Amino acid sequence: KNAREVIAAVKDKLETLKSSLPEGVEIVTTYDRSQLIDRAIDNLSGKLLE
């Protein structure tokens, strides 16, 4: 399956769930594969344009 849309949905849900968590608990992201995908896509698009 596709990973970028899944990460997007996961982030949207974790964001809309921050209000339902108890007082003091935080969710910190550790590994996120969307960053590498975005960087690669941007690099290749810039290379094509150049």
Binding site: K1, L14, L17, E23, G24, V25, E26
Partner: protein, 50 residues
């Protein structure tokens, strides 16, 4: 799941994870699994005196 209040024990955080987020993040269309790492599993220990 970090707690910058020294209030919620590790067992509370892991129970929250298991019984709330494993179900929240699993409804996403093509998420195969949501595994839990670390934390403590509450247990009812009965120690018998011989």
């Amino acid at each position: 799941l970090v707690d910058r209040s020294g209030k919620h024990d590790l067992a509370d955080l892991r129970s929250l994870q298991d019984w709330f987020l494993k179900y929240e993040l699993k409804t996403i269309p093509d998420v195969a699994e949501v595994a839990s790492v670390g934390g403590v599993v509450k247990e009812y220990q009965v120690v018998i005196d011989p």
